[PDB]
Design an enzyme around this catalytic site. Sequence first.
Site, PDB file in Angstrom:
ATOM      1  N   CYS A  84      -1.451   4.732   6.014  1.00 20.35           N
ATOM      2  CA  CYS A  84       0.186   5.993   6.494  1.00 20.35           C
ATOM      3  C   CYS A  84      -0.654   7.052   7.823  1.00 20.35           C
ATOM      4  O   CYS A  84       0.017   6.184   8.596  1.00 20.35           O
ATOM      5  CB  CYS A  84      -0.685   7.020   5.486  1.00 20.35           C
ATOM      6  SG  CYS A  84      -0.085   6.944   3.874  1.00 20.35           S
ATOM      7  N   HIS A 178       0.031   3.204   1.115  1.00 19.75           N
ATOM      8  CA  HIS A 178      -1.094   4.236   0.259  1.00 19.75           C
ATOM      9  C   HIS A 178      -1.024   3.409  -0.640  1.00 19.75           C
ATOM     10  O   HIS A 178      -0.576   2.376  -1.137  1.00 19.75           O
ATOM     11  CB  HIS A 178       0.441   5.534  -0.377  1.00 19.75           C
ATOM     12  CG  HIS A 178       0.384   6.542   0.668  1.00 19.75           C
ATOM     13  ND1 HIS A 178      -0.213   7.204   0.572  1.00 19.75           N
ATOM     14  CD2 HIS A 178       1.188   6.078   0.637  1.00 19.75           C
ATOM     15  CE1 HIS A 178      -0.455   8.153   1.306  1.00 19.75           C
ATOM     16  NE2 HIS A 178       1.471   7.916   1.382  1.00 19.75           N
ATOM     17  N   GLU A 180      -4.107   3.760  -2.263  1.00 21.07           N
ATOM     18  CA  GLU A 180      -4.250   4.138  -3.522  1.00 21.07           C
ATOM     19  C   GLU A 180      -3.305   4.256  -4.339  1.00 21.07           C
ATOM     20  O   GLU A 180      -3.856   4.875  -5.839  1.00 21.07           O
ATOM     21  CB  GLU A 180      -5.342   5.501  -2.752  1.00 21.07           C
ATOM     22  CG  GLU A 180      -4.193   6.886  -2.389  1.00 21.07           C
ATOM     23  CD  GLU A 180      -3.810   6.651  -1.105  1.00 21.07           C
ATOM     24  OE1 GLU A 180      -4.068   4.795  -0.662  1.00 21.07           O
ATOM     25  OE2 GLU A 180      -2.650   7.265  -0.921  1.00 21.07           O
TER      26      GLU A 180
END
Length: 200
Positions: A84, A178, A180
């Site tokens: 990010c 992202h 995750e």
Amino acid sequence: MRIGIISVGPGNIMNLYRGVKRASENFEDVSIELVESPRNDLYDLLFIPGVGHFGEGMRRLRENDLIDFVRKHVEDERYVVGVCLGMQLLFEESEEAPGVKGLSLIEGNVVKLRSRRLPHMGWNEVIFKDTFPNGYYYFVHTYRAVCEEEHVLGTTEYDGEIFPSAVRKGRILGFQFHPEKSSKIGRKLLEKVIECSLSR
């Protein structure tokens, strides 16, 4: 080996921690630690996460004397992965914060997406040159990196503009999305990252 995740930078990093944790499961002898200061010895995999503005990102890094610690990892031939905002911090500068120097770990700069409807949010495809899984990931950003083809790992389009959603320079990786927050293909991405740092 030892995986480190910088935990000072803007934005909560526990999510990326959980993601990296669960991903390092299928392997072993994998240690994960949060990094707040240089008061730690080199890791094999160092993650530089974050969600915010270029300027604050670098400020939280220098305020905690982590800049050299990161530059130290690259020179010492270790894997550094920007996620990010952390991916943007890898470059020399950004329009989002004039005068503020980036980690300058990769030649190129950061500029705002051209689209009229910002910030870029949602799922979009990422097409990789190699190694990682093509597919949809979750993005939330207003700026993009501008680098040379040599360092483009993956691409993504948003409102007609194609930009590098993933970059690479040696053992330095950057992902604008992202991992995750990208479910299945995300954990898979994180796994592939750990996998790569395990070899060499």
